[PDB]
Amino acid sequence: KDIDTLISNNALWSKMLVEEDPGFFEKLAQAQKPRFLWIGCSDSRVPAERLTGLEPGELFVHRNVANLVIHTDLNCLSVVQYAVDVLEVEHIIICGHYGCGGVQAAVENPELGLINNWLLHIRDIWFKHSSLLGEMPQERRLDTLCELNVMEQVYNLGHSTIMQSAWKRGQKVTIHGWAYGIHDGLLRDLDVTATNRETLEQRYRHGISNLK
Amino acid sequence: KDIDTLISNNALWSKMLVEEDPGFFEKLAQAQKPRFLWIGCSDSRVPAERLTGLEPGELFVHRNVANLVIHTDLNCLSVVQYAVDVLEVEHIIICGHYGCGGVQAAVENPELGLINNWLLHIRDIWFKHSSLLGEMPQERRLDTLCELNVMEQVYNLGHSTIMQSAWKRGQKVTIHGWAYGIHDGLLRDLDVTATNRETLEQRYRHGISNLK
Amino acid sequence: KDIDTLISNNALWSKMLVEEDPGFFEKLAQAQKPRFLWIGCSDSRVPAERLTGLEPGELFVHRNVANLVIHTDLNCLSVVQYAVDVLEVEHIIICGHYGCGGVQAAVENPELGLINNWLLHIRDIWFKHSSLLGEMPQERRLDTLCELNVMEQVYNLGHSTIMQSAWKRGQKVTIHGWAYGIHDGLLRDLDVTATNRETLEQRYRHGISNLK
Amino acid sequence: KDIDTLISNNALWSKMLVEEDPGFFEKLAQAQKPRFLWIGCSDSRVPAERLTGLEPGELFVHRNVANLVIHTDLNCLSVVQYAVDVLEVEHIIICGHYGCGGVQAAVENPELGLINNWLLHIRDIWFKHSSLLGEMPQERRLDTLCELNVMEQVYNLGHSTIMQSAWKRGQKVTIHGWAYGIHDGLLRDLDVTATNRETLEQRYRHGISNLK
Ligand SMILES: [Zn+2]
Ligand SMILES: [Zn+2]
Ligand SMILES: [Zn+2]
Ligand SMILES: [Zn+2]
């Protein structure tokens, strides 16, 4: 596909919606805010809307390389703060994916340029879980690191001042850690779901334990 | 929709693909890299794949509040550098949208919290184009600011060291500035398309002139 | 000077303080917090303590290339928020300097690498004030840009959510914009001093007017 | 001290230099670049020039809360890249300090606001070294964490793409990790000095071993 194809396809799709789904934009024109924030990877191998059935307007989205929530990344933190404090999303889903190019590059460590600095945060997680990974068969280690990465980003998200403040004041927000692969598109819930500061810690340990 | 609904819908969708599109993941399993990078807004009012017909695996994606390319945002710059230098995408599309909550908040300036710092970059663009906006009817000013924001982010992207280096070395990368609204989902090409350092400047001025 | 010289000089200086100034560390050992935050340039051509006579413990310090307060730089914003909310500094001084290598590189635009992205924020200010600079003799333009840069960083600092919140709640914090050169080390007050949201705007315009 | 005092002291100091040290600015007026980059804490309890005897023009400086080199902090990375690639500094010194308010806040974890996000990077280091710290007497743990923080920031600096590139191309740059306290101002060399990729790893382990 080329650029002229995208523009032309868009024009035809917009016209065909009049017959196929004349109401396609009706919920978007209402003041209903999205209830979900999705933090995923720029690889976007299967779009979040396809994976879940979520409709236009139901999902606020951030994507970056390897779906990180770095403690001091103001881009992601600004998405989160707007979603939690202004849109009042009820769920935040961090979704990783098996085969992620960012996770693979963190492990193989090729000299890729500027991106290698971003990927050092993944190498820190790999270091953190070296003993756990060493108890597992080698062929499962890379996908396990993909899962651990998600769990650590959920943990970071729950430790941000944004989430700590929301939970302290009794706002209902739940964080989830998921992963999928392109072998079937099937979401795996990594079982780290957090609804407050206490469950954040308990279920982080639970998710890691399920891997041990 | 609730969380159990998303998980259950995903499981049913994955199973139904066997009959509907057993080859759905086949291109994803190949080593073909995406040819397009989409930088859009976290509002994600209509997903980029729906707007354009792009299939899974064809698009690398970054989203942040109001689709900014801030000169010093390492999150977006890391997506861009990986896309340009490692994946060798041929097109980068920055897409804004009429009615964007981030653009509207920049103009109305409510006290929203942390996000207001991010939005100051939009207020700088609004200031930059005050005289242009003053020559236009008031009712068209907010959507014109949405377009100017896209054009300025294209300009910032082309001035990044990543893009300047790629163009200097003769890598073929084209940057585009688009917008759409939810009244019809129809993409408007803002006509700032840049294939090198010279067209970046020429077509930036062209796009602004088309508004004057 | 070499590394062994620094270590050896430090050991001799520490010993000599017993006779010269046995009380040198006494105020540092007290709980008195610094009353001033200095945001300056990494060039650090004359140290802030030498310029002003401020003693150890009186100054909290941030330095970066060309003394910027970028709207979305969490490093500088974190220094500011800790200084304002935790240390309760009463004064923030942004100090630029004539001959700054960062300002000069923004104007000459050599291909320096990663730093060029940071310097684009200065090029934006240069663009903003093109008409003002054009009314002045060429030989004064670079130093005038140095001053305008300081004034714009003061303006950015006052527009941060940190400062807006502090002023809204009645905390006494004053922001100042200064510059000096190495021809005499003499500080010039650029006359943009702000004690609240209103004086921020009034004195920003005043400082610019003093240049016109 | 108040603001009028600083301005007045500066004017008197500038005049008195004519008799005391008429050549004070002479090296600054030459094209000699600084040979040292100092990365220190915004606490700046004893200024680096006082600790070492370094003269004006000999030191390029960055300061942030708790002297961090975060993998993805473009402010510090931009200082480093300009210092290494443009100024060609020969030494980078990361200096922490015993009693640092940032390190103490990471351990005590008060609710301080925005700064808590920055401090999570220190809490990650505290977690990393929990077993080491547990083998030591409690009263020495906080200062040991101050030292470990410096060592980890040296390690991060050496793993940045900036430093890896410089060492790969044979540029002579040495990184050092130091600390001091206000009980005597005496620098402690933490013995993690790195001149290439190999010594970075060897001396990181050496410095940690010296603590065990
Ligand atoms: Zn990925
Ligand atoms: Zn938007
Ligand atoms: Zn400077
Ligand atoms: Zn400190």
Numbering used by the authors:
A (entry chain A), B (entry chain A), C (entry chain A), D (entry chain A): 2 to 213
Direct quotes from the study:
Carbonic anhydrase (EC 4.2.1.1) is a zinc-dependent metalloenzyme that forms carbonic acid from CO2, a byproduct of carbohydrate and fat catabolism. An endogenous carbonic anhydrase frequently contaminates recombinant proteins from E. coli expression systems. Here, the serendipitous discovery of two novel crystal forms and one new, high-resolution structure of carbonic anhydrase 2 (CA2) from Escherichia coli that arose during a crystallization campaign for an un­related target is reported. The presumed Zn2+ ion is coordinated with tetrahedral geometry by Cys42, Asp44, His98 and Cys101.
Here, we report a case of persistent CA2 contamination that crystallized in three forms. Two are new crystal forms and the third yielded a high-resolution (1.43 Å) structure of a common CA2 crystal form. The coordinate bond lengths, as seen in the high-resolution structure, are Zn—SG(Cys42) at 2.2 Å (range 2.2–2.2 Å), Zn—OD2(Asp44) at 2.1 Å (range 1.9–2.1 Å), Zn—NE2(His98) at 2.1 Å (range 2.0–2.1 Å) and Zn—SG(Cys101) at 2.3 Å (range 2.2–2.3 Å), with the ranges reflecting observations from all models reported in this study. Sometimes, as was the case for the data sets resulting from CA2 crystal forms 4 and 5, there is no match for the cell and symmetry in the PDB. The fortuitous discovery of a CA2 crystal in the previously characterized form 2 from the same protein sample revealed the contaminant. We present a high-quality carbonic anhydrase 2 structure that may serve as a new standard for structural studies.
